[PDB]
Amino acid sequence: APLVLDMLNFLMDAIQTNFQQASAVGSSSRAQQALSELHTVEKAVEMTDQLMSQEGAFENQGQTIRQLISAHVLRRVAMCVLSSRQHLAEKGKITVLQLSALLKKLTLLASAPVPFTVLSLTGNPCKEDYLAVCGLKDCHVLTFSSSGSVDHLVLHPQLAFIIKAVWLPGSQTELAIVTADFVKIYDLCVLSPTFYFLLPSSKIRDVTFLFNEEGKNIIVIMSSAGYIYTQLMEEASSAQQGPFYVTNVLEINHEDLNSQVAGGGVSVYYSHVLQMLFFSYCQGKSFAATISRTTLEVLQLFPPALCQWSEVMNHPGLVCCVQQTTGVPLVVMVKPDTFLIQEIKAKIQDMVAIRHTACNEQQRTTMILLCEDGSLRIYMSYWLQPSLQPSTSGTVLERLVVSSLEALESCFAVGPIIEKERNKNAAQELATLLLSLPAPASVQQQSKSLLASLHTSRSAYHSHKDQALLSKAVQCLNTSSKEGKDLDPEVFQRLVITARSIAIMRPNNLVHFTESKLDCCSFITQLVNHFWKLHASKPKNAFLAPACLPGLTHIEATVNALVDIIHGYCTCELDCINTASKIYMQMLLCPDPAVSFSCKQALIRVLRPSNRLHMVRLMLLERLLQTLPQLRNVGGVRAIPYMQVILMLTTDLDGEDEKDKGALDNLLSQLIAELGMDKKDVSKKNERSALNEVHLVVMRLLSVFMSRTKSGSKSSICESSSLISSATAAALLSSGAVDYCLHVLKSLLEYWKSQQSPPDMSPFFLRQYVKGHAADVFEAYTQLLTEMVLRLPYQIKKITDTNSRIPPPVFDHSWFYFLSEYLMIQQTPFVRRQVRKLLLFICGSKEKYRQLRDLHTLDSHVRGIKKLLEEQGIFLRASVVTASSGSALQYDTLISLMEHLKACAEIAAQRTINWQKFCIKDDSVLYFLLQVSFLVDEGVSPVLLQLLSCALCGSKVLAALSQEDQLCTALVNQLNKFADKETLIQFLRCFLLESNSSSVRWQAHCLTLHIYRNSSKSQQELLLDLMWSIWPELPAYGRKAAQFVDLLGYFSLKTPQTEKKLKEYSQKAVEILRTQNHILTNHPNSNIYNTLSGLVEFDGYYLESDPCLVCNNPEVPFCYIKLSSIKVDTRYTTTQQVVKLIGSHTISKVTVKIGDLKRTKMVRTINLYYNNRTVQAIVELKNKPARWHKAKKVQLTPGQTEVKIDLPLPIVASNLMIEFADFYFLCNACGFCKYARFDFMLYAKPCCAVDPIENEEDRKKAVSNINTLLDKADRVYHQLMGHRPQLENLLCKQLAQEYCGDCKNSFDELSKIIQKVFASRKELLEYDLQQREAATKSSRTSVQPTFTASQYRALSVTSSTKCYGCASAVTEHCITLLRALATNPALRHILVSQGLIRELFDYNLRRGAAAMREEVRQLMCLLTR
Length: 1425
Prior knowledge:
It comes from Homo sapiens. Belongs to the UBR4 family. Component of the SIFI complex, composed of KCMF1, UBR4 and calmodulin (CALM1, CALM2 or CALM3). Interacts with E2 conjugating enzymes UBE2A and UBE2B. Interacts with RB1. It is found in: Cytoplasm; Cytoplasm, Cytoskeleton; Nucleus. This is E3 ubiquitin-protein ligase UBR4. The longest helix is centred in the last third of the chain and has 37 residues, at 1256-1292. The protein has 46 helices and 40 strands. 48% of the residues lie in helices and 14% in strands. By secondary structure, the protein is of the alpha+beta class. Helix 8 (458-483) runs antiparallel to helix 9. Among the domains are: 25-54 and 304-389, no CATH class; 860-1015, no CATH class; 1042-1111 and 1359-1425; 1119-1247, Galactose-binding domain-like (Jelly Rolls); 1258-1355. The protein is elongated, with a radius of gyration of 50 Å.
């Protein structure tokens, strides 16, 4: 006891030295001292060596390269070591390998074919990822992938020799390449470098850059003349204002130091690891200097040529130069007071080295130096020792001290009370002094046990321990503070650890002591200030850091522990809180995420899990909310933590207390004012604004509030809602959020039209989207704002409807109009789904939903069609469609009209009541529609008729193939109101008789039927009069007019009227019948066909003089013919195939059948081009711009096997050109495509046309063509008229072969010629009238006559009278009509009084076919009933 203490009192004298010096305690002072001694104390060069597979393992304008390298100007270092991985590494291909086997007769990834002349390869120092492969005037930047396999972007040097390039220190994104006169620095982040410098004189020998006292860039070059020059690269010297002349030259006055510095310099290198720089000349002298951090004044200086020292990372003080002349690499290791230089057939070309881990997990440096024979050499701590590097078998001293602790423990536990108590005071003092300084952990344990025993109350042990230790730490820190000396890293760590431990143990006593006054708790604020300064002191780039690890080490852990301490001290004493808030806030807004994120996680863990804690929560909510205005410039990405914290405290928000409800009120009010729902200059929201980003974050916060659902118990009461949710609803409704949202959406309409480790940033911006767009989770401003401005009002409505008390919100019809406008503008799935839910909830009933969207669709489509036609001049006056130029529109206008109209047709197709309703809304749909169909091309007629027929006839009848009946009846009366009689006649004529199609005629019949069957009574009379009037000319439109006959008959037998009218009609019909009969009877061609019909199978009356065009154009059906079986010529190029088909065909569809597709190479998109322009040369029309008319842009999925491209209106084509538009392959000569094979077909029938007309060249060409065709037809005419003689001969007494052989084929030839001739005449007239109107347009007093639509149809581009077929067909139709109209008994009497029985029995008795004759007999029997 007394003797133990007696020896120990002396022992502590050096025991304190051992304990403080032990461990990392004492490392900081030793390191700083050694650094000072290195930079300050003199050293001497010492020659020594103790510091430190076969050849042929290696492979392989070089003359001028030899020249420059001989000039010693440049050299070769072909090596690199990419590791932070295990990557390490003439023919323009160098192999980059791994050396793992050597790492843990050699056993030694990928290779890269270098496309540039290579003298070296340099990895970026901050990041071994990118490597620059370096030559003189060509170099590359390669991002080798994870396995080392080759992307490469080849750097454009624009050489007018580039010495070398360096990626800026710690700047993995920056790099500069310097040549012999100028240096250009570019950032890979942003061709155009961001810096450029040049020299007023001499060459650029060596160029380096470093940091300032703050750390800013400075560029210093040892020139060719040796003049060392310095500059500060900023906005002035940057390449933005141009390459800058170098200005200042640093001074060195040594004994050795005339425009040529001792015969030139050698190099330049300013190590940041040593915090120094070296200097050397082509004289061959070496020296070392350290200079001021801002004055750059060389503070401390010390004294074959030299080149290219290299420091191994994680290997302090080790440098590897190479003698310029001797070629000899030399190693320099510098402790403070000496500079050991060591030198290590196989003429070493280069070397490499890395401080790696050997088989013993020991960081030993391995150096593989490469020779001239391909051989290798293996080569291999002053600052690297643990006592210099920041962090009982040991000390027999610690062993004896442990023995002493055992002795003291025994001398207490078995020692008497008297001795124990008498020695108590001194022993406790000694033990306190012992535990005071840092020492062994086992010493701490033994002392703690002994001292807790010594304290009779272990609570007293803890109390006295807290008081003493805290006082000691506080005094130490306060000395360091008033002193202003920088806090040692481990010092702050140890203090924070100790205080955190004591606070976690006994926070109340901690508050009492750290609060007792030996403002409030200045230790806390001073400690935080210390933390801020020290973190500001962090080594910026850890690579470029000085030999020590400056700044915090386990930074986030220190932050979390400090937060624990601060929160505890705040909790224990309430009156400090107003401070702590701001303190924490300055941290919860710090720049680097390492502070803010760690603090947010810390606090969330901190306040998490009586009334005391809730009160602390409320007070914090008030305090931070006041500082909420400070985030005005925070930046959204640098602001999510605050809101995460607000919600985090809001986790247990029970507003039930009047105070608690008041708290909710303050929160909601502050947030709402922060958003500012009443700005009214909302157009500023369009751009991405910092306050805008913060605002959006706040909105997402309020949304996580409203969407918060405090799901209750099993009870079905509708009032178990989150009080936070109810409040958010109430406040947003009070703030008029609807109008703000709507003004935002309208304001965004402009942009919408114009557009055509990861931090756990949950829950504001989700983790997945973080993974997907880690660039900036506040970057997608427009889309996120749109999503929010939608998804808020829906939830607002959810609460609003759900609340019994609150009357519902009211948004005006602008809501429907604007949201529907949003829907039609395209958007991705999220926007679409949200908008749909919004409209559906808003408009209540799904019927109303679909109806409203439909009406919008129709309104847009009609507006679009009207504007399209107006772009061609067509103008509706009030209800009078008028046109000025009557030309036919090109394909562009037609595809335009067809797209919109067909869309409308599909819409009306889904259901009819919608089309009926939309039409009932606007009275400007019908007459415009019919007027448009009257002028539009024929191929567009079927669609327009389908729509109009759906409108008036309706769904019941059309599908068959009261409310809707009323709609149809009213709309029929409407059409009656708007229609003009002349237009009605023009419609009947154009679409019932003249049309060539069958479906067109059928639909015409349906529309006429339904319109007539329901028009007004007197309207019915008007229609009957008009139709029976037009029937007088039925001879001309002739054989195609069956529909009109049927319609006239139905109208006749259904409608009763005055006998004068009926008599008039009967007179008309009888006269027509008689005249047609007579025209039949005197026919010169009557005899021959008359005889021949009863002899051979008479198919067609092939004995007409001027071919009846109506009889001469049957309806050839579209045949599904393969694109193979029509070809005439084919060819291919790199990516296209040109085929010249047999002849002009009207293609409506085409199908690509794909065989044996290649997974490596697929074609996604294809562009098809048609051309119907005259060409006999395959090469001539391969010009894509001239001879390609695009058809349909078709892109499919990869692997798609059957494609069906159908032109909306069929295209008339001759030469087709198919190109594989987009990919996901055609050979030059034969076009073999090893990807696959393709086949094609088309549902087409031939089309008889010519070349389109373009120029007077076409005028002469076509005139000649038509003339020649006329010659051919003339030969046909003479020869064919010749058959009449021999035909008469065979008639006099074979004939099958005679005419059925000849006459048929003859008529075939003449028909081909005639059809071609007519089409050609049409084309010539088209060009004539088009040039006429165009040249007439220039005349200004000549206002081009706006021709009516009827004038237009007659203006724009009939069976021949003496056609025995025409007369016969007229007879058949007339017989049908007569056998019909006789049915009225009064009509029986009237027709009998006509006495036509004579005419029929006499003229048409045996005429007509079998069926014709039989019907005739039936009629004759009937007429005398």
